[PDB]
Design an enzyme around this catalytic site. Sequence first.
Site, PDB file in Angstrom:
ATOM      1  CG  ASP A 181       1.163  -6.476   0.365  1.00 50.03           C
ATOM      2  OD1 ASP A 181       0.168  -6.190  -0.381  1.00 50.03           O
ATOM      3  OD2 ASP A 181       1.184  -7.249   1.269  1.00 50.03           O
ATOM      4  CB  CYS A 215      -5.738   3.812  -3.290  1.00 49.46           C
ATOM      5  SG  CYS A 215      -5.110   5.435  -2.781  1.00 49.46           S
ATOM      6  CB  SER A 216      -6.234   2.018   1.358  1.00 50.42           C
ATOM      7  OG  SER A 216      -6.958   1.719   2.826  1.00 50.42           O
ATOM      8  CB  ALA A 217      -5.936   6.989   2.447  1.00 60.11           C
ATOM      9  N   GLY A 218      -7.488   7.001  -0.405  1.00 61.29           N
ATOM     10  CA  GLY A 218      -7.767   7.680  -1.458  1.00 61.29           C
ATOM     11  C   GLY A 218      -6.664   8.983  -1.915  1.00 61.29           C
ATOM     12  CB  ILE A 219      -4.479  11.128  -0.328  1.00 67.61           C
ATOM     13  CG1 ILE A 219      -3.725  10.121   0.816  1.00 67.61           C
ATOM     14  CG2 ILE A 219      -5.685  11.405   0.075  1.00 67.61           C
ATOM     15  CD1 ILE A 219      -3.400  10.733   2.061  1.00 67.61           C
ATOM     16  N   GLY A 220      -2.578   8.546  -1.949  1.00 67.45           N
ATOM     17  CA  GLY A 220      -1.418   8.123  -2.353  1.00 67.45           C
ATOM     18  C   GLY A 220      -1.451   7.684  -4.059  1.00 67.45           C
ATOM     19  NE  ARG A 221      -0.983   1.182  -3.225  1.00 69.28           N
ATOM     20  CZ  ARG A 221      -1.248   0.203  -2.899  1.00 69.28           C
ATOM     21  NH1 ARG A 221      -2.265  -0.578  -3.443  1.00 69.28           N
ATOM     22  NH2 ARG A 221      -0.556  -0.423  -1.851  1.00 69.28           N
ATOM     23  CB  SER A 222      -6.127   7.889  -5.402  1.00 74.03           C
ATOM     24  OG  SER A 222      -6.872   6.695  -5.105  1.00 74.03           O
ATOM     25  CD  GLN A 262      -0.915   7.903   1.435  1.00 76.89           C
ATOM     26  OE1 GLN A 262      -0.911   6.697   0.713  1.00 76.89           O
ATOM     27  NE2 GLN A 262      -1.333   7.605   2.688  1.00 76.89           N
TER      28      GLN A 262
END
Length: 282
Positions: A181, A215-222, A262
């Site tokens: 998390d 992912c949630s915003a599509g920029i970090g983990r993605s 991010q």
Amino acid sequence: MEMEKEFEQIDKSGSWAAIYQDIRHEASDFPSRVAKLPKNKNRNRYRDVSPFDHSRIKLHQEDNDYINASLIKMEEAQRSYILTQGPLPNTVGHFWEMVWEQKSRGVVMLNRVMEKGSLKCAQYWPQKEEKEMIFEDTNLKLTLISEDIKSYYTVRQLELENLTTQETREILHFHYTTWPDFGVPESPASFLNFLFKVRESGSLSPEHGPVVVHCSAGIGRSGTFCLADTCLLLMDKRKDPSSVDIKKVLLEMRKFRMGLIQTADQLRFSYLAVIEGAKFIM
Ligand SMILES: Cn1ncc(Cl)c1C(=O)N1CCCCC1
Ligand SMILES: Cn1ncc(Cl)c1C(=O)N1CCCCC1
């Protein structure tokens, strides 16, 4: 500089935040006018994460062709990816319309539906074989065929049917379920194992449309997923693998979608993943 020793030099000097801020300063800025039209407000999860106009995926619809999704096309590596936000209640039908129209084989999900006590994306696939989903706004049917639950990730086989033509296709859902998390994983070993399972399925290969990753915003983990994949592919293709510059690859990918990676911790984790991955490949 090479990667592994540039890495130790940033650790010893504790300058990850300064390196990451340099990337933010040099990154491309392109218009995202379609994303900001008033009619699209409930199609965006976050007001500060938008696709650029030049690289956005268009839905094949004449009313409203907008989805928060970008095509990342890596020319030297010969790989393409679609990066998108986690679907919203009013965009689950658009999401599967995109998968269909772009001829994707695989969907890569890097978040849980609930994290930190809040919803990070809609429950957009069926959880039981006998309870299929129908998306009436886009005329698609989605059925769970099988599910394989492992310690760090789950793989699902799904059937997507275009109800207009009665054509069907098999979609693979690769769900990484153990990203913490807060922060990043301590070791990249399970993330790399997951990447290799996606690769082995054919979902990243040129005989299919681009993989859809979110992912949630599509920029970090993605961003971490596609950056690691592309860097490892370039190290295999080139005569001199130490010439691969992860900061230059990241800036190239940021020409196609804003904000990829991010935090400075995500940047350090991406270096770690590429470094460890390059040893296993050989
Ligand atoms: C079961 N179902 N049928 C159509 C759709 Cl869409 C869904 C679904 O996943 N949701 C969640 C988001 C808003 C309400 C519906
Ligand atoms: C890259 N890789 N592939 C499988 C595993 Cl496991 C890992 C990994 O992170 N580690 C730790 C470093 C040495 C190799 C083991």
